[PDB]
Structure formats: structure tokens, C-alpha cells
Amino acid sequence: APITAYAQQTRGLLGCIITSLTGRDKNQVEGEVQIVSTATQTFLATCINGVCWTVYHGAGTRTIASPKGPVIQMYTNVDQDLVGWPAPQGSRSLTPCTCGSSDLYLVTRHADVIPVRRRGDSRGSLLSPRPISYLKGSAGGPLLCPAGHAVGLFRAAVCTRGVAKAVDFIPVENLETTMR
Amino acid sequence: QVEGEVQIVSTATQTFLATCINGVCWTVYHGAGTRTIASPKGPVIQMYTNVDQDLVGWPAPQGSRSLTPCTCGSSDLYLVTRHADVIPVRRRGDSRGSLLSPRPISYLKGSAGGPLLCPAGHAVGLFRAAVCTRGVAKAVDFIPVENLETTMR
């Protein structure tokens, strides 16, 4: 706090495809949140406690490309819409939040930080609504408390006429449950 | 190609800050006056000049990007200084806040025009002036971002 964010693109279309098939990625890894792609979808993966987490509806059961070839998921939970791999070498992890706060901040793939008012275990409303296409490709990204600790992972938008008014997320607690 | 939301600016006698919000480069009247801002194509005139509010605005320059205004109504603020230090501030009234840890006045010197941020990094206000007791800044006076929004209208 203040929470601020920037984005960097590390790969183009062609290199992504080639790396996708080979599963071998020699690029250096930095940051807490990874922008990730498959052949058909781009979305986010957030590192929390040494594990790199993302949504199942984006990753399926896929491996992640790494410097040593493909790496298999450590955790998979279709119901919770959740997947995890060991955090890449060089990444940096967030810490789960223990203030129980109700003011949240969603970090999007554009590196914006948008405020969210918590209204339930795994639900929060936007203080200012957004085109659904804005939030698209942000699943897997973190909801943060005022201290920059992780509260949840963006899963789904509550949308109407193409306008997202609220967000549905996976609470950190559920990660702990998925680990067990 | 990295862009900055905050400019470090100078007149012949002063140095202070400006902040870009919503396409406008804003700073304090008591620093800029009615002055134009320099550009590689020559002077650019103010788009807004509001003396009551101590507020001045030019179109945002090259090498800059705009801050988004705060919409979360938080009272935990963060002032950013010309040295890029971050100073936590608790909001008291519309246009006042107090430091969590008071500092010598020289620590805030030359930072007027800088932003006050909420936990989200959005703009809450523009730092107007240090509220001082015997060389020690204990509070801050600032221009709330609402005032910038209405000035534009």
C-alpha cells in the first residue's frame, strides 16, 4: 500500500505457440502475477505461498512451460475452478490476508487496480461498473486487502447487458482446503 | 516509453510538482501562476485557472499518463513527494489529513502539486500545503479531486 501495478509483455504470438508445443521456456520470470496463454485463451496466474494458481476454465489440466520442459499441475479442483503449479523460479509470492477486511482491490491484466466492496465469502461489488470486455482475460488475478495481501482469485463477473457490476472469486481459504 | 503520472516542475524561482488526472496536468496556482507550460512546440496555455481553489491545469504533456480518481472513499492516504518517498496520511476533513509520522518541513518541501493516493493508488487530492508547527509538518492541506472534476465542468 498504496497498491500499484505495471505490466510487461515478454513473448509474442509466434514464440508463445512454439513454446506451447515444446513446453520449454528459457525466459526469466519476475513478479507476483503471470500473464498466461494457451492456444485459445489468455488469462492470469497468481503466485501465493510458493504456488502459482489460476482458473481451471482457462488452464484445464495443462502443463506449464518451464526451463526444464513441461511441469505438471500440483493441484486440480474442477468444482472450485482452481489449478496450481509450483511457482516458477524467479517469481515472487503474495501472502494470504489475515485482517479479515472488507475493502478489496482487484488487479486486472491491464495492471489497473480496481476497488471492490466485499459482500459475502466469495462475492464483491464494483464501486464503479465496467464493460465485461474490460475484465475479460483477468480470471486468475488477485483480490487484495489494503495491505497488499491476497484475499481471493478472480473467477467470474456478475454481468448484465455487457456491464459487470460485481465479481465472484475463489477465497484464499479454499486454496488451503484444496492443498488438503 | 515508460510514462509518469507525476511531473517535477520548475519556474525561475520555485520547484514543485504537477499531477496528471483525466488528461489534465494539474498543479498549484501559488506555484505556477498564470504561466504557460513548456513544450517542444513552444508554450502551452492553461486550460483551467481557478484562483479560489489554488488550482491550475494544462493539457497533459508528452511522457505522461493519467491517474484515475479515487472512488472507494477510503481515509488511508499516501502522499508522494518530489523525492518519490511515500508518506502515510489519515484523512480528517474534506481537504485535510494528518501524517502518521510527522517529519521536518524540508522533507515535504517542493512537493506541492503532488498526489494524495488511496490504497488503490487512485487520486484523492492534490497536495496544496504543509500544515506546520515549529519546522515540523504534522498535517497536510489538499485540493480534493471532486474540485478538479467540477472545475472541468
Binding site: 500499484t4 | 515508460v2 517535477i8 504561466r35 504557460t36 507550460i37
Partner: peptide, 16 residues
């Protein structure tokens, strides 16, 4: 005289 820009601050810390 004009106001002149003498440097810039990026809030996110993004490097070049």
C-alpha cells in the same frame, strides 16, 4: 517565463 518539466515520477516503479 514558462513552467518547465525537470523530471518525472512513475507511481508503479516500472523500469525502462
Amino acid at each position: 517565463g514558462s513552467v518547465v518539466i525537470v523530471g518525472r515520477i512513475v507511481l508503479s516503479g516500472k523500469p525502462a
